[PDB]
């Protein structure tokens, strides 16, 4: 018997079993509807300071493997699941889930009523919680740390997960046959994109390369002036944890870029940054969107896409500046999903066109981005 306890800000306790590191973990608690893709989710930087609960009972059926990691580490603050399977059974598995968590030093609990949890969060909205795994997990304590949690509202986490120094990315996407391919040679990639690392998913980068982009990853705080110097064929605003709002450096920069004719594309946090930079306002959603079955309509084409979502903040549609035209909306709640600059080659998507995990439905968003580039180069 290796106990684990999870306590929410409201005093709601969930007693289960420890399946990862011994320790405590505090963060915002969220729920994720993805029936597959747990590993990629765990390694999503946007999960920084967030305790992840998965709705699908059995988590770990396929074990883990390096190709399925979206970053260099496990961003989730903690993991809450209903059942940890006896075994991992998949040809791609290199390490069982528990071993994996232990290895990444993650506090995780299993065997709790995840459904009860989920409905709580949906009903009463996001809550901060704490997980304690050890011989005797002190509830009172757990309540203390959860309650003590600052909160993700107004929390800039992009700066925390961003690369120290810039770097170059030339690697493409995985194949069943080929696995993760060798990185390409520079002369091999047509365009050169500058990507702000706000806690970037490897899949976004790989998918950009896939379309013939050579990348230069840059720290979040990099200055427009510095970027411009690079003579970028386009600029990219990655996804990332926390509140976009407090990221003044990024906003300021973006505005600078928006004075030029260079193509700009934002994904998730980058979407929010773009919006803010344009004069819009962001809000923190009740419980947000975390799942991979989220319908999003392309208002222009009147076509729906099932997408991969991971966001706790949104862009308020009703505050949109006239230079911002709505391109996509959620079919689940009507929330804002995409925007394009009426006047500039700048657009973004709230969801994850790169998926990983998730439907490949929104991939074409990238395509547009290339178009703009190809056309910016024609000039």
């Amino acid at each position: 018997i290796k106990s684990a306890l999870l306590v929410l800000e409201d005093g709601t306790q969930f007693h289960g079993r420890a399946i990862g590191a011994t320790g405590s973990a505090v963060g915002e608690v969220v729920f994720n509807t993805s029936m597959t893709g747990y590993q990629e989710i765990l390694t999503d930087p946007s999960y920084s300071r967030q305790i992840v609960t998965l709705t699908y009972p059995h988590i770990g059926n396929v074990g883990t493997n390096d190709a399925d990691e979206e970053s260099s580490q496990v961003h989730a603050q903690g993991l809450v699941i209903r059942d940890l399977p006896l075994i991992a059974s998949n040809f791609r598995n290199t390490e069982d889930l528990s071993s994996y968590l232990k290895r990444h030093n993650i506090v995780a609990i299993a065997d709790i009523d995840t459904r009860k949890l989920t409905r709580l969060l949906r009903e009463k909205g996001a809550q901060n919680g704490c997980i304690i795994a050890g011989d005797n997990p002190d509830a009172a304590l757990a309540l203390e740390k959860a309650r003590a949690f600052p909160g993700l509202n107004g929390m800039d986490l992009a700066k925390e997960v961003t690369t120290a120094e810039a770097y170059s990315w030339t690697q493409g996407s995985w194949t069943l046959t080929g696995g993760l391919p060798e990185a390409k040679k520079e002369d091999e990639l047509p365009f050169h994109v500058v990507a702000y690392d706000f806690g970037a998913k490897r899949n976004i980068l790989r998918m950009l390369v896939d379309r013939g982009c050579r990348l230069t990853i840059v720290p979040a705080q990099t200055s427009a002036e510095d970027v411009l110097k690079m003579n970028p064929d386009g600029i990219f605003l990655s996804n990332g944890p926390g509140d976009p709002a407090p990221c003044d450096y990024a906003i300021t920069a973006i505005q600078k870029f928006l004075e030029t004719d260079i193509p700009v594309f934002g994904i998730c946090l980058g979407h929010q940054l773009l919006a803010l930079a344009s004069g819009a306002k962001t809000v923190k959603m009740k419980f947000g969107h975390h799942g991979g079955n989220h319908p999003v309509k392309d208002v222009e084409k009147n076509v729906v896409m099932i997408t991969a979502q991971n966001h706790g903040f949104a862009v308020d549609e009703a505050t949109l500046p006239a230079n911002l035209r709505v391109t996509h909306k959620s079919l689940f709640d009507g929330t804002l999903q995409g925007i394009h600059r009426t006047d500039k080659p700048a657009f973004s998507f709230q969801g994850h066109p790169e998926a990983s995990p998730g439907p490949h439905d929104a991939a074409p968003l990238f395509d547009h981005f290339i178009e703009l580039i190809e056309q910016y180069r024609k000039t």
Binding site: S34, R92, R115, T118, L176, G292
Partner: protein, 1058 residues
Amino acid sequence: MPKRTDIKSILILGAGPIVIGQACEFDYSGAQACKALREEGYRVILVNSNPATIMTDPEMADATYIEPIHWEVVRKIIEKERPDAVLPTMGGQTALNCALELERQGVLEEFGVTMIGATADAIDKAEDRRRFDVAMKKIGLETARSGIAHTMEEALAVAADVGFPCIIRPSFTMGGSGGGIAYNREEFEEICARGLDLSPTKELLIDESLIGWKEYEMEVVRDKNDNCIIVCSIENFDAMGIHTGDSITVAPAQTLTDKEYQIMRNASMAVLREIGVETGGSNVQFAVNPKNGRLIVIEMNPRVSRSSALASKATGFPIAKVAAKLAVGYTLDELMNDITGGRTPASFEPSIDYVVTKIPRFNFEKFAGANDRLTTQMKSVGEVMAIGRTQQESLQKALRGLEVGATGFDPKVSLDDPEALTKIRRELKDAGADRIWYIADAFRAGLSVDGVFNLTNIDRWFLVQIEELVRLEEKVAEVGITGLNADFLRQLKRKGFADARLAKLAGVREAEIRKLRDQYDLHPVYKRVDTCAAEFATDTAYMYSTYEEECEANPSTDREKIMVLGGGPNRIGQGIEFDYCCVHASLALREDGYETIMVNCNPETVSTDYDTSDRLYFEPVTLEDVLEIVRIEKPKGVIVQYGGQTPLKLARALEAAGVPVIGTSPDAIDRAEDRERFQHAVERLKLKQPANATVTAIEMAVEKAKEIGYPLVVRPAMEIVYDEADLRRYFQTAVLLDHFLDDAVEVDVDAICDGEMVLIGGIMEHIEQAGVHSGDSACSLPAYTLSQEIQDVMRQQVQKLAFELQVRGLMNVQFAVKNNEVYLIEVNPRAARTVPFVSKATGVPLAKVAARVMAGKSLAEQGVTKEVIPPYYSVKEVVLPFNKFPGVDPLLGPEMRSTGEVMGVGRTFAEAFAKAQLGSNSTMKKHGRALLSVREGDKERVVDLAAKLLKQGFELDATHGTAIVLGEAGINPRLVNKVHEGRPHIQDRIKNGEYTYIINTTSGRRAIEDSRVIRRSALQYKVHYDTTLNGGFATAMALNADATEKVISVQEMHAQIK
């Protein structure tokens, strides 16, 4: 776009009688589509020869045709209703096949009927094996190495290309009909011949083996805007090589990584796009090599299916409802999601926070000489489904809900059996229906996970789970009841162990375990199905039990509640008929204002459609599970009389536990079911009953037999012995002893008793005599030979019995008429399977009436007091599964083997019969050569039958004894050699297409066994044959009729009643 407007009327092609591989799932789907289109304000016309369907209920559509599902007949329906469009994707292969014939026959053109949902081309593209294969390659999806055949020669050549074992798959068939696995040449020829003949397009696809790879399915829905969604993914437990329908399957998929799942998901959508399914759903099948993720496309079903039904139950997403709406121009984004209170659109992919398990139900015991090994051709007669928070819980719940007397992993072999491992080994290596239990026994016997894997190819992911359950059971057995502390017991419950299973291991009564849970306050919670993993609330109460924290039941304190217990998975003898009743009980009572609670776990049925009731508990129909619901619902009354044997068997126990059982009491039920109890009441009532004995010893029987008199009906399976020598004979191979009433008419009577009066629902005269199971006999309503004089006697006898036994609601009585004498065969104090047919025939919804009676409203009070005798004849005919089990002698007897039934409506008996026979898929012709080969006791009457066929233009053939009798009558048949006689013999003649009709009657175990060849050949070669003289006469009669001449709707039928 919104709904189509260039359409007003829609004809929906129904599935026909229930058969192995094409079952209840089509009533559910068909009903959903009627409902959907009807809600959309279309005029709906439907055809379905299966009267036991909710979709044929008069109030569900506008023009309902219970007519044979033949293109000529449908043509007459189209000619007469002039539908604008036809939807052919809600009725099995029957509907697909018919839609295309109609097209081929140019009928569609002729009347300007537009095919919707799916086009003829799409359908063919998926149904034509060659075409499908071409399309896959065209979209870069891999398919097994294969080849097309249209002849045995070509087939032999493909086999030669792929080698054995090989997989044979007919074009235009499903449920593995006409297919199989050829391990050798011999087998190869058999299967292939069979499938070529059976293929509507006389085409086979022969593939190399992928046996053992993983098997997956995906349910897809695509709209005209090109929106596409995965409604559900399914991972088969049983690997490739065992048909999906005969496999244990779960949702969602479990062992694919997200990367693999996306590829599969992309493939699925690509397949629909290529085939051209633009406005509805489809089931896409695949094979995955566990070793490397290698993906192969197996097939695609351009329609609703047993999997889409399963998927609908599993996720809460009503596929068929949505599809019907798509068929009419609606787009997914336009429709709302039912269960999330319409709060969200149908354009999304469901997410579930639980595990769904489906386990097929077999009936091999009913087919002695059949090959009981599982293969690519379905052999299952039904299925159960379970929902659990975990796989173990889910699986165990399904096992206990299976209705096979399992409480979970009950042992099959003894621990102390020296040959046990060998037996296990065999069952594992060559899966039969019992495999699941042998797996558990394997673990108890010392076999490892890897060892079991190697034999079975079932993914270790599942296997480890069963092993863990075994180890847990071993603990229980060691610690015994003493060791069942609250902590441990809870752990056990969470893994889905039934109280009964635990009881057996602890050597206590199941009630003890249950008391123990009461003590510890260890009760399950109820979660709701919502399609979105609780991301959105729901206003629907579709729930399942689980041992968790939070309860989602929220019972009302408000209403008086009525609970309706389902029968679980369908099996032979316990079909859709019972579910029909259950549904009616619910619609009526609900309509009456009660809060109706349905308890059932059959994924195929309308009973488990959340629309059917106020509250749906998708649970095993067991005392344990029902007690838990009552516990929390505190219903006013519970109906146990409508779900067949399943709930019937729980009646006593439920009452004992304080359950408020309504309608005929459990004691009352027992008086009828108990031979002894029953013998006394008969005696009590001064009623006629065949002489009977109760023999314990062989020699006791032979004496008692002398008393009773031969022939004899030996009920312990049933047998009919004819002489002393026969008695021993049986006894060897082998107790009630009953005189068998030879040359007797069998009759069924359905009635309702409210304690005040008795309402006669219907008097049905069977065609086949007593001795041929009522369930396998065709019948007429009204009788077609029975004197009024005699029927009245039976009516009076039914009233006498209704009152005596205290019937409260439905009943059914079976009599035998011999020499103007009424003999009582049996009484069934509940809803019988004839109920739906009688309701249809008479226009009286007996299940609804009996339900109201059970609930308090008298017959007088409802204004249903007089027996209805319709102006037309209604004939019911059955469909037998013999074609699925060729080793089986296709002969009728005292034991029921049929799967379904149809109904024929005619101005005369001959016309009704004609329609019934045709509806039953009979290959009868109105010309040709007939073969007569009858027993002694029939030689007399055969003359008149031989003449009748003569008048018709038939030529006759006959075996020795028959020819002799006919000769003496002045009828000179063409002699034919019995097989031992010489040549040619019947076999040869039948095999060479000589006959268009066969009448063969036999009496005596020995005589039967000897004549086996005739029947088996008649079936294999598709010749219509009768095994009863009564049957032949009926056939004779029908020839004078034309089943396509006229068609009438149920609405019309019912308006004709005065």
